[PDB]
Design a binder for this molecule. Structure first.
Ligand SMILES: O=c1ccn([C@H]2C[C@H](O)[C@@H](COP(=O)(O)O)O2)c(=O)[nH]1
Length: 248
């Protein structure tokens, strides 16, 4: 893997380390999560993955807070943000050091409804459409099955991730592998309002990760937070290169 070029400037976050292909930031100040509302951390982080790769952005905490897992497109030159939701019905705080924020690369592939190309080219994921109307009540999870197999790509593995638009509205998708038998996709509404998602609405994205990026082995090179403990995410072995001019 060629270098991941990045810029980072944010007095409220500490760069812990950029090691073995993963950059990790930690919060230096208390982050308040109001209940029933989205909390968005503006990271002051900018990054460009090498050829053939996308970037994975995720948060880790032992507190009752769930973060959106972000898929970062190769063409994205804006600021990276972490989107957080509160699991509780009262204020939850992330005290200093309680939130870790990770960025790492992965190889992906692209096949040529319900699986759709986004209208902007070299994007990592393909939009997946809802097969039925769903009503998502506050602080509840709703699941839906996708049964028809996606195209098979040699040496790659279809996965499902959420998108940031619904995440901002309080709706998170739990990332998961789309195995041959079908996938049950779970949507959780962390807001106080009922969200009605209609049949055919895009509700998640399909990403083909190179098979090397999924492992059962725990190590400083993998993380169970992303897609869960069965399918550990093992990022590409890239080097981070600071390029200050990327900061906007
Ligand atoms: O958690 C995230 C997810 C995405 N993005 C940026 C990079 C993506 O290329 C772009 C669009 O994301 P989606 O709307 O496809 O999720 O927003 C973030 O900053 N944080």
């Amino acid at each position: 893997c060629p270098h991941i070029r990045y810029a980072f400037q944010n007095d409220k976050l500490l760069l812990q380390q950029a090691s073995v292909g993963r950059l990790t930031l930690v919060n230096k100040t208390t982050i308040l999560l109001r209940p029933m509302k989205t909390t968005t951390v503006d990271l002051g982080l900018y990054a460009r993955p090498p050829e053939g790769h996308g970037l994975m952005l995720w948060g880790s905490t032992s507190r009752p807070v769930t973060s959106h897992v972000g898929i970062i497109d190769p063409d994205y030159t804006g600021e990276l943000r972490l989107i957080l939701q509160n699991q509780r019905r009262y204020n939850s705080t992330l005290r200093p050091s309680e939130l870790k924020i990770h960025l790492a690369a992965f190889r992906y592939a692209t096949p040529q409804g319900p699986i759709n190309h986004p209208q902007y080219p070299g994007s990592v994921g393909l939009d997946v459409s809802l097969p039925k109307d769903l009503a998502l009540f506050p602080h509840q999870t709703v699941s839906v099955t996708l049964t028809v197999p996606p195209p098979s790509i040699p040496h790659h593995r279809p996965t499902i991730f959420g998108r940031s638009g619904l995440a901002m509205q309080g709706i998170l998708v739990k990332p998961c592998r789309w195995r041959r038998g079908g996938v049950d996709v779970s949507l959780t509404n962390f807001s106080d309002q009922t969200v009605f998602l209609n049949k055919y609405r895009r509700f998640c994205q399909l990403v083909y990760l190179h098979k090397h990026h999924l492992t059962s082995f725990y190590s400083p090179h993998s993380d169970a937070g992303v897609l869960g403990p069965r399918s550990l995410f093992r990022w590409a072995s890239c080097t981070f290169e600071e390029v200050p001019s990327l900061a906007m």
